[PDB]
Design an enzyme around this catalytic site. Structure first.
Site, PDB file in Angstrom:
ATOM      1  N   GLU B 380       0.846  -1.183   0.000  1.00  0.00           N
ATOM      2  CA  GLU B 380       0.000   0.000   0.000  1.00  0.00           C
ATOM      3  C   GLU B 380       0.888   1.242   0.000  1.00  0.00           C
ATOM      4  O   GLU B 380       1.794   1.356   0.823  1.00  0.00           O
ATOM      5  CB  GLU B 380      -0.939  -0.033   1.208  1.00  0.00           C
ATOM      6  CG  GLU B 380      -1.816   1.209   1.347  1.00  0.00           C
ATOM      7  CD  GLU B 380      -2.577   1.582   0.087  1.00  0.00           C
ATOM      8  OE1 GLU B 380      -3.449   0.796  -0.342  1.00  0.00           O
ATOM      9  OE2 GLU B 380      -2.282   2.656  -0.475  1.00  0.00           O
ATOM     10  N   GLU B 423      -7.438  -4.295  -6.351  1.00  0.00           N
ATOM     11  CA  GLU B 423      -8.753  -3.679  -6.301  1.00  0.00           C
ATOM     12  C   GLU B 423      -8.647  -2.287  -6.922  1.00  0.00           C
ATOM     13  O   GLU B 423      -9.193  -1.319  -6.397  1.00  0.00           O
ATOM     14  CB  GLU B 423      -9.203  -3.652  -4.839  1.00  0.00           C
ATOM     15  CG  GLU B 423     -10.703  -3.450  -4.640  1.00  0.00           C
ATOM     16  CD  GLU B 423     -11.127  -3.297  -3.187  1.00  0.00           C
ATOM     17  OE1 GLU B 423     -10.255  -3.316  -2.290  1.00  0.00           O
ATOM     18  OE2 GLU B 423     -12.345  -3.155  -2.952  1.00  0.00           O
ATOM     19  N   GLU B 432      -8.389   4.133 -13.188  1.00  0.00           N
ATOM     20  CA  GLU B 432      -7.494   4.282 -12.049  1.00  0.00           C
ATOM     21  C   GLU B 432      -6.100   3.750 -12.379  1.00  0.00           C
ATOM     22  O   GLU B 432      -5.270   3.602 -11.485  1.00  0.00           O
ATOM     23  CB  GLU B 432      -8.096   3.575 -10.837  1.00  0.00           C
ATOM     24  CG  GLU B 432      -9.101   4.448 -10.095  1.00  0.00           C
ATOM     25  CD  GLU B 432      -9.878   3.732  -9.008  1.00  0.00           C
ATOM     26  OE1 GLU B 432      -9.325   2.817  -8.360  1.00  0.00           O
ATOM     27  OE2 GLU B 432     -11.041   4.126  -8.799  1.00  0.00           O
TER      28      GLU B 432
END
Ligand code: A1H73
Ligand code: A1H73
Ligand code: MTA
Ligand code: MTA
Lengths: 625, 625
Positions: B380, B423, B432
């Protein structure tokens, strides 16, 4: 009643802390987002590669709790303006990290300190954060009334406290704020959290903060005195300050430990509540005004525009004004008509701009209490209002009132008037072109005829308001000049501002005008002696009017008609703020200009420094003829 | 439940009329402002100098009553498009007078009729009124489904009714509306009051009104059938129409006299209530969606931006999505690891973009139901989210999950993955930059490794929505291109629109990509067969994704995953609306473009007419790498 929060710099369990704070009656909690002592490295190894979580999880509270009940705090070790290059760079990265985490949580506010003079790099980092992404999170700058250096105990042997009266030096904390917000270019996200000290400074130092965006007032527990009962209270000096702060509707924060250990911590808050309840209640003015505090509105132009029904409604909901008009006419009838000519002489009254007919009514009441005969006309150009007049006239008034649907400048009168009554005055008196209208209606006045009002004057006073300046700024619109908003007056209930000098008369008009070749163009120079350091942002406008003799209306603060609320003050802004030292004179110049189509104002500051001439040729603002 | 009003063209006493109407359960009252028959002259003497009041006084109702309960009506004699010059000029002056009086009263709405083809001068006068002063008063254009000429009784001997199927001719009332609102330049103040007839037209004629700003639906009393009980009802044809209209949340107006004399007038309204209660209730989708109807929002860019806590929260509040991810991983574990290698083989999973860790959890659940060993990484980049991950990891997960705080394109992996889970999909799938991220993370996948999702596709469909077009229009901002708003996609719950053709696939991506010199630039031509007359305003975008095999997610209407509400559709507007006849093909071209810094889309219509290429060089919209 009062909105209050709690400042803590120690939160061992975030869930438990809130519970205690909430039980004590506090609305929100100021707390750190990272542990105050948890100092972090971002450059040098191996401390930069420190493992584990950097702070608490966002899951410990609900989204709504973060959004409403928590106020962030910058950690104390973060010093972006440090002389050491390493500490600077580290504090930069840390500041962004904490500010970003604040935005991540969606905090409503975040506290940053102003505890020294140079906060340039602090301002540069914050400004960058403001211009990164989008957020509505406020930033409360923690700034003391009195700097820590200036309220220290005189207990150092070879460094005594300054026992000299330094007028400019005691205002230093304001200059800290001023410079910071100037660098940040008057961001509406940046506000003041004013920290109150044990010894309040001189009165001028406090007056400095008038017109500044104060959102919070931090109250230490140390400043509280103890009464005979043994519970926290404040001095009469602090009481007057809190009373002033309650008018601004700030949020009071309590900081520090419980010095009143025997009592609860609620006692502090209960005292603020006690003060909140114990204030002079809002008068009819402040009752109605509550809502329009520093709300900019465009000046009405009932000549150019046709006013709506509900605009006339709110005019009529001012009984003080019409009672004065009633009394004004009442006296004029007695003066013009003697007792022996009571039922011989019928006076010709002419309401010029009758609207929905409050004056017609007042003229009827005035004639009845005087016991004199009158013949009324009701001239009104707005055809929508004339519908109201004629329905009233048919049902109630009758043939005594002759409703005319025309402009007064055009209307060919079948009879000359003994009295003309008008209500053509705005917040700057002549801003609705009462001079031009009554000049054009002057021909059908008798040679010995009266005008009500017979005279009116406009006043100006310089004001400092960083709030209102920032409000005007935000009235920039597409498809026009970027600075058009600064070159036009606004009707506004002036609340968060500072009046730098006493109002002085600007423009005066007398009706009937008997000066050959009547000119309504004007040029007025005013000099305003300032006795404080400040920053000029505009000029508040008021007016007085003489209806007949000793019958007057006024919105000038010192001679304000009590109870009346039919005119808010007007505001003439300036493009750029102007710094003004104590002793300096603010010199403003005001023109009333016109051509065949329009009327407008221009203005300029000439001292202590020159501004640009505002609204040249009415480019930004005109009043329609 | 349902918002309903009453149309009257006869009001003898305004106060008494309302009372009756209000007692019958109606919310507002449509009525004239001047007496319908009171015809007025404005040019020729002596009728122009007609004395007395022109209509009722505004004092007969309170300001609030005018503002909420009354809807104005243009008098029937006013015909601005008359062939006779005198009647034209008179109708002009009268129209302005009535419209001005409407604004004076502060009415929320005002009815004007569209009962003929040429309403040009009507439009010219209304537009002038809209651009005079400031008001928020709506204008409801009274327009019938079927023109009066087309629903007349065939009882004229030498003029029989058209018994021919005229496809374009039966859509004429829409063309009346279209031309009017085009002349007025899509004013947001101008809306439709659709008048329902006795005989409903063909289905296509009704579909024409999809995507139009319908605010009211006028229902005559004549169209109501009578049941066995002897009370008003509607046909199954009309019932289906009312059901459609209830979804749009229009305000139903009742007009005409009481044909059901034996019953009350409330019965009509009670039937609409009866229908309102008796509808299919809102599903989980429509429950949550209720609020965001045709609300334009900017597409999220979680790469360029760091998402807030509450943005991750609403993602996590979609249990259908993660159950599919759980099931997807569950199966992949069983396929990759046999039964005999249950406790020998530990699969290396890597959640790329872990957020606050819903997938990490899902991967844990998937491994437990499968009963297979896994080793998790949680990559992340957002450091604010990593705080959540590490706190979870310390408390709950443990050393099985290795939280990595890095970009996946940068991260140097200490181990290759058997599975990667992501995701990174938006409403247009690749908006995205999932392609770029997973391409950069591809190197640390095993040669036989799996990606979840393994594939995703974007779809496009042309739409007609005069509402949404007018919504985009109003996103013009200072200090940028005047038409920038048209050259950028929006996330929006499409409600008041019409889908002109079936969705077709636009761009597809497969992971892992095994095409040498992987290029994520694309160019796609689509041809959409249209079977109706319409006006194209943009292109709705959807997407499908294959997680593993038969495990899929989709927001494509025909294959939409039931219950899921984690992606609203996307909207690609166009600068200018494009008229499309029945039988014509809409041809759109879509590019996916990129440089080292940015990715963006461009698009153009090439049939039936050419549009300009939108967003060239990503001038108006880019997606940050
Ligand atoms: N001819 C007249 N002109 C004038 C000119 C004025 C002042 N005025 C504006 O210019 C103006 C402009 C606006 F956009 C909005 C309001 C105003 C007012 C009118 C009322 N009001 C006070 C108030 C408002 C709200 C309130 F909750 C309490 C009090 C103003 O400030 N009052 C007249 C009365 C006359 F008979
Ligand atoms: N990586 C991801 N990207 C994405 C991208 C999306 C879609 N998206 C936006 O782009 C967007 C942009 C906005 F300004 C605001 C909201 C969205 C959403 C996220 C939620 N939502 C549905 C919704 C919202 C509100 C509601 F009351 C019901 C339902 C969208 O339409 N969802 C993801 C989930 C991931 F995991
Ligand atoms: C009661 S507020 C002042 C009124 O004067 C009216 N008025 C302003 N200028 C004129 C004018 N030149 N002639 C007639 N009425 C006027 C306005 O329409 C308003 O109703
Ligand atoms: C759960 S929504 C998708 C998540 O992927 C993360 N993400 C997007 N791009 C990358 C990237 N290149 N490397 C790592 N995480 C990413 C985002 O920060 C977000 O938390």
């Amino acid at each position: 009643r009062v909105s209050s929060g709690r400042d803590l710099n120690c939160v061992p369990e975030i869930a438990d802390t809130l519970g205690a704070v909430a039980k004590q009656g506090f609305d929100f909690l100021c707390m750190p987002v990272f542990h105050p002592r948890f100092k972090r490295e971002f450059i040098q190894e191996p401390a930069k590669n420190r493992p584990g979580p950097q702070t608490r999880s966002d899951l410990l509270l609900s989204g709504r709790d973060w959004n409403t009940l928590i106020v962030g705090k910058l950690s104390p070790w973060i010093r972006p303006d440090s002389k050491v290059e390493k500490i600077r760079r580290n504090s930069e990265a840390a500041m962004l990290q904490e500010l970003n985490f604040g935005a991540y949580l969606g905090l409503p506010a975040f506290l940053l300190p102003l505890n020294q003079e140079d906060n340039t790099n602090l301002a540069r980092v914050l400004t960058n954060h403001i211009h990164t992404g989008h957020h509505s999170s406020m930033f409360w700058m923690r700034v003391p009334l009195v700097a820590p250096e200036d309220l220290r105990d005189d207990i150092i042997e070879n460094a005594p406290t300054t026992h000299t009266e330094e007028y400019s030096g005691e205002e230093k904390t304001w200059m800290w704020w001023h410079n910071f917000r100037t660098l940040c270019d008057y961001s509406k996200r940046i506000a003041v959290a004013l920290e109150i000290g044990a010894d309040l400074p001189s009165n001028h130092v406090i007056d400095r903060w008038l017109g500044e965006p104060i959102k919070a007032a931090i109250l230490p527990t140390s400043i509280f005195l103890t009464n005979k009962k043994g519970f926290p209270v404040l001095s009469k000096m602090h009481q007057r300050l809190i009373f002033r702060l309650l008018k601004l509707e700030v949020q009071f924060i309590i900081t520090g430990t419980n010095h009143h250990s025997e009592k609860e911590f609620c006692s502090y808050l209960q005292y603020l509540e006690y003060l909140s309840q114990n204030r002079p209640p809002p008068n009819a003015y402040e009752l109605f005004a509550k809502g329009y505090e520093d709300y900019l509105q465009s000046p009405l132009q009932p000549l150019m525009d046709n006013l709506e029904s509900q605009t006339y409604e709110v005019f009529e909901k001012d009984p003080i004004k019409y009672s004065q008009y009633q009394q004004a006419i009442y006296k004029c009838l007695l003066d013009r008509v003697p007792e022996e000519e009571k039922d011989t002489n019928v006076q010709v009254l002419m309401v010029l701009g009758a609207g929905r007919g409050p004056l017609v009514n007042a003229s009827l009441r005035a004639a009845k209490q005087a016991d004199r005969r009158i013949k009324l006309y009701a001239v009104e150009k707005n055809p929508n209002a004339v519908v109201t007049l004629e329905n009233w006239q048919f049902e109630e008034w009758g043939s005594q009132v002759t409703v005319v649907s025309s402009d007064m400048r055009e209307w060919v009168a079948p009879e000359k008037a003994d009295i003309i009554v008008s209500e053509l005055l705005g917040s700057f008196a002549d801003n609705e072109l009462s001079p031009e209208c009554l000049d054009g209606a002057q021909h059908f006045l008798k040679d010995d005829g009266v005008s009500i009002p017979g005279e009116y004057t406009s006043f100006l006073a310089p004001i400092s308001s960083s709030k209102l300046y920032n409000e005007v700024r935000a009235c920039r619109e597409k498809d026009r000049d970027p600075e058009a908003q600064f070159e036009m007056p606004y009707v506004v209930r002036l609340h968060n501002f500072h009046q730098l000098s006493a109002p002085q008369p600007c423009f005066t008009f007398s009706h009937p005008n008997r000066d050959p070749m009547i000119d309504n163009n004007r040029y007025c120079t005013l000099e305003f002696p300032v006795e404080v350091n400040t920053v000029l942002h505009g000029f508040a406008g008021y007016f007085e009017t003489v209806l007949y003799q000793d019958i007057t209306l006024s919105i000038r603060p010192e001679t304000h008609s009590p109870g009346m609320f039919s005119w808010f003050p007007i505001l003439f802004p300036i493009k750029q703020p102007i710094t003004v030292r104590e002793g300096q004179t603010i010199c403003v110049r005001f023109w009333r200009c016109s051509n065949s189509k329009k009327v407008w104002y221009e203005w300029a500051v000439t001292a202590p420094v020159c501004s640009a001439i505002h609204n040249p040729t009415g480019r930004s603002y005109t009043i329609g003829l």
